[PDB]
């Protein structure tokens, strides 16, 4: 029951999809051959939320890899855990991506959708009770920003009642992985505002600082960044996969977070994060978990909470612990820095808990929060978009695909409506 | 699967074709006798039914005196004999003969070779054009060949690594003429055109490599290092894989501005490697150094409309974003307002390869920079002066108008430069 | 000659997947009257009495509007 | 009891029949020597539906191989299973067919009927209780199409109460194996509208799709496609040959299928089909059989059922399974995507089951669909006919055999009326 | 049961028959002395009481100087000497001599020999006629033979492979007359005609085989390869067998249009073979390439009306289908509108055989494409313009009028050729 299908579309999508399925596989004790080698029956009780049984007792992930130019797919197949995916669940086109939203959404998306959806349906029927969909996007690139939104639109029409979730990697404030990032951003955010129910924004800048200062790493590879992201993605469905003295389904998480249908851009963080030196010094207690999680540094996106107001927040704990302490810590926080919280919400946090920690750990905690400091990213993005669009740089590339300019102005107005909505409820 | 087509025109095109194709045969362990003692060589080759790997290139020229050397050199078992195309007589440093008299009865003979050379590709990225602007075959056949491609392929990506007439060092008197006529002919037909001068690479050989007896076989070895560093993502794994389609999109603002600069770092002798450490920050600093530019243009007189970076070797992504941030803090470097972005980046886990008998040094970090600066309006203007200087008496014209040209094609080709000159200022 | 849409097998019959990057000839598919006007639409029915316009040896027999 | 007599006309029929009798014979454990070497007593009970006892315990098939230019019979008469046939069931003419429907129907066919009919009767009376006929065709050539239909009209009148199937392979939409194909098609269709009870249509092209899109084969041969056609043909007579908790005779399969006497064209598909790598992941249950068969890819004909509506359908499951799942599954489909099923037929599927799966499997199925998308074969053929019949091309070859002209239009009008019947009942 | 009869008339007829038979004996293991150390040789041969395989061909000519080379060569134990037919005097490049004066004395024995040769046949498929239009014997005597064969058999199928008078390279001056005369004579009687030109095959030998000095024997080797490929499906197994009637029906649209081009691929040298891969897509692209046409016609000046392809060796039907679909999608190939279809494909498992001391290379895939295009209007226009330029002055006409003709035969032939080129224009014109 409560099955979940997983989508990764793009280079960044497909690469973090590798780490995510490696983290989950180690959680439930399955080898890259697909066989099971865990000990408890807890690994086998709710394996069906992500995997499908096979002959001889194998568990294949319920994932889809969609990406043009299968180069990165050939890599993840050559990876250690590339033997687990069904070769059927690969969708690729021989053409190039272009780092372009248009041809991702209009030309080559158009021919891949025929096969992507048939793959989606044939595995969504295997579910006895579909909970929702989750995707891994990257708003800079062309495939992710173009195929992903086209896929989400189709998904929302074919399954509107369910929950589609997004871990979108947004552009970075100072460094820019590509040059047409603003155009790729707005044209995707304009699609996200109508067709998304939950969308956590991540930024590589925030990931770099956490990996540099806190984790004290010296050569943070994208393998490590995705080990971070894979950790925080797994930390959401712990209530689904494992028992808990206060469990929290995915649906009730949104119900408590988003007060309005359009404010679904969250902000995440994981705890605990220590160096190899400080693992000896600092303890593992709930006050420790909550002190690091509320910090303005664990925010995996480059938004500053001290500038905005928290609409809602959420915490998910893992490890046999005392549920009075968590309720006390979250209340204590609200009373202390009360100005950062809205007043017409009495108690604006939810708190889950799971009796099952990560594999090698004993206490962990994961954070989600819907702040009004998220509007800053959209202001910075909207500013860069209008600066380039006022002169029509790189525009012949988009209009060469049957796009017009109303599709840009519509996108920019819809992003301007969103940033004003966030400004209203930010009463400073 | 990730396949390209490499074209070499004129003597320079073939004189670099020996350099690059000596590099790849070395970069994939390919013996000069075709065979070796997948998805790696398939970018540049075609594994026949038994053993041998044929390159997917075509050496086109009119003088027999260069292509026969290849037919007798050590790299004679390599090439399919029909690919190496050679005529009886040459265009004789004359744009007309390469465009109206001789070129017209060999293009279709080349096209039939290109036709059969594009079908065996299962996924095509784009054509690579090596040109020699300033001669007859390079400037005449080249421009005539591209138009025949633009009607046959149209949307495909054709790059141009066109060596260009140097300001001071010059081995021709009429080269201002057949250069102007070349641009106006390729301007509307090439997708993006890199520039590079023989003098700018001479000083590189003087300061850095410290070779005081430089020859062309010391320059062509520097160009192969660029492309091997540019097409690593096509055939080697590594983070931030980047193909050619995504290369022209976020680099060419308007359909006109596609003349770009190039660089490379490090470039050191065998011994100073034992005097250095070559940190990634030091590399990209020297990559933006005007002294490390492969064109005799000065960027500190203009502004940057875009940049493209290809790193290679032991590089991790945090430092690319860390050091680029520093360059954006420096003030010697400017950026036109309507592109706050501008840094497409790329990584590869395969360090550059060294050639036995070469002059570079075994290293583990490298950067190949490609930028679209507006200062490229200076090297453009001189060609418009020397053309206008000689055209006032119409010297040497009785040769062009003797081989099927009239006065139209001169003023026609002269205005476009004026139109392009103001275009390089309208962007300011 | 024309190319009639093979509906379920119409994918994998573009020029691209057949290793042809040479600006495909589409008029062979566009002369047809398919529903959506493209490769994926179904065509239209007829009455089917099928007159002649030509005698035994070719040579369009009447004043049939023809391209010289 | 329930005997079946089998015809193979034309080159195609003489080659599909090769694999067919190789498949069925192995299913009953009989050697190419004709001797029984199976194990169970189940094979011996209904062996007489296809074979006849002979001295020494040999079992010769109840087949009839007829063809002009017996060259192709020399192949099968020399194959591994070519020693089982009776030599008197080899009817052939010394001359050739010529891919000409006329002489395959009027001149040369007529000189063979006097002999063929003595062959069909002498082994239609040896049947104590004749069930029906079955033939294998090819609507392209002359022998299979011409002699095929001419044989039918003789059979239709001699044995009007018995049932006549036709596994006719029809022309392909995009590549035609013959040029005169549309002429030969309609002139045969005009015979099958009136002289056929059931007519399964197949396309060599859609067979290629299933062959490398589902089976993911590398070098498909006609020997492998016939291993597909012979799998569905064998999948029909299971209820005749093997016991089952819900049997389905051949006659009851028609009455439940065709509502009106003219719509006797179907489309078939087989299940399960996996690669050599997929059998490791996918499981074999009824929900899998019921989605791969209902999909719009296993349809062995080149007609997309999603462009029409299903009138009725069928399914012949094989293997000890739960007869509820089959009942509720075929129910669930009609309810989910109700747009593809007609309304004035509430429950428009029939479901049989056999306790005996294929020789090497544990569960399997077989599908028969009577959709209104079958008209698409008739539109595409109608135009290709009129485009060249209005010009009188390739026609002097048909009047050479004294054929008339109205025999072309009547054959066409009969079609263009059949294409409308399929549309009245398609209220979209 | 699958038996054909071969006729080699004129000099070039037997010049290419020698190559074809050196090919067939080697392909079927037949030593030059008739016998070898079933149903595989029966297409071309007949077994005597013990071991001897005599070929079912006929070599007809009027010069003893070539039939005697054949009689004295190593291939002298093969033929029944009554098959090798020669005459005392030759036609001397004169249609009138070949038709009215000389050939009418030996038609009687040629026909009774053809009767005796077709008697032993059980199932006769058709008559192959290797002719060389341009020389009196070839032209006139083949016209006379074909008229007699049509009145005798009629129902049988006649393929004629006619070495056609060439545009520029020509070893004669009067041949524009006898070419028109032979066409006007045989048009009503041949069932299909395959044209091929010495200049085109010279160009092929130049560009592909790297041979620069072909002495009329490389061309014959190529023609032998072509016929072996074309008649494989008669004596070799393989999917999609194709015989003569199937070959002609779906290829000849109108009673007039029955002349067609030809091609072959791959055709390479023993080193480019070893340094190439020759996939089926490359093979079909090279076949449909104009520069591979065995005749001096450019198909891009017209529109195809049908094509026939015979793949040999390691070929699969899906690959054939995909390559034909790619050709259709291509833009430089045109097709006259009234044929939405247009390809008759066949496969054979037997790869093409190679000869000792030959010049081709051992391959495993090969294609012999045969198309009926509306571009041979250009070669008919060439021939008619040359006949016109000459007959405007009554040049050489006294020879033809003295050797038993009159003038009206020139006007009949010229009007027939004008009508034929108007046909090739009209039947291609679209509404
Ligand atoms: N980088 C590099 N440049 C070269 C080389 N050889 C020549 N060049 C330059 O190329 C330009 C002319 O080279 P060519 O290829 O001979 O000119 P062309 O197109 O062949 O015209 P024709 O000589 O008339 O046939 C000059 O500016 C040369 O300096 C070389 O080996 N390497
Ligand atoms: N492909 C090929 N063509 C040949 C050959 N020998 C001659 N030809 C051509 O055939 C034409 C002449 O035909 P012939 O057979 O020699 O003349 P003829 O028909 O015997 O008439 P007479 O000479 O009067 O007896 C010329 O155009 C030759 O180029 C050959 O061996 N191979
Ligand atoms: N966590 C993580 N993010 C990446 C990685 N590679 C790329 N990204 C981001 O992916 C963004 C560009 O999108 P990309 O997937 O590479 O191109 P696309 O194929 O057009 O979607 C860039 O902003 C990169 O920063 C990676 O390896 N790990
Ligand atoms: N599944 C299958 N189809 C074939 C085979 N051979 C021919 N066909 C089809 O049969 C058609 C030609 O009809 P053909 O049997 O040769 O003419 P006939 O002798 O008059 O029946 C073509 O469309 C072929 O594609 C085969 O071996 N297997
Ligand atoms: Mg030169
Ligand atoms: Mg002669």
Residue numbers in the entry:
A (entry chain I), D (entry chain O): 1 to 428
B (entry chain M): 1 to 37, 46 to 436
C (entry chain H): 2 to 69
E (entry chain k): 1 to 37, 46 to 439
Copied sentences from the primary study:
The inner junction (IJ), which bridges the inner gap between the B-tubule and A-tubule is formed by non-tubulin proteins. PACRG and FAP20 are arranged in an alternating pattern to form the IJ linking the PF A1 of A-tubule and PF B10 of the B-tubule. Our results suggest that the IJ is made up of a complex of proteins involving PACRG, FAP20, FAP52, FAP276, FAP106 and FAP126.
Using focused refinement, the IJ complex of Chlamydomonas was improved to 3.6 Å resolution. At 3.6 Å resolution, we were able to segment, trace and de novo model PACRG, FAP20 and FAP52 in Chlamydomonas. Thus, the IJ complex is made up of two copies of PACRG and FAP20, one copy of FAP52 and FAP276 and one copy of Tether density 1 and 2 per 16 nm. PACRG has an alpha solenoid architecture coupled with a long unstructured N-terminal region. FAP20 has a beta jelly roll architecture, which consists of mainly β-sheets with a small α-helix. FAP20 is sandwiched by the tubulin dimer from PF B10 and the α-tubulin from PF A1. FAP52 consists of eight WD40 repeats forming two seven-bladed beta-propellers. The two beta-propellers form a V-shape that docks onto PF B9 and B10. In this work, we show that the acetylated K40 loop binds to FAP52 and forms a fully structured loop. FAP276 itself forms different contacts with tubulin with both of its N- and C-termini, thus it provides strong anchorage for FAP52 to the tubulin lattice.
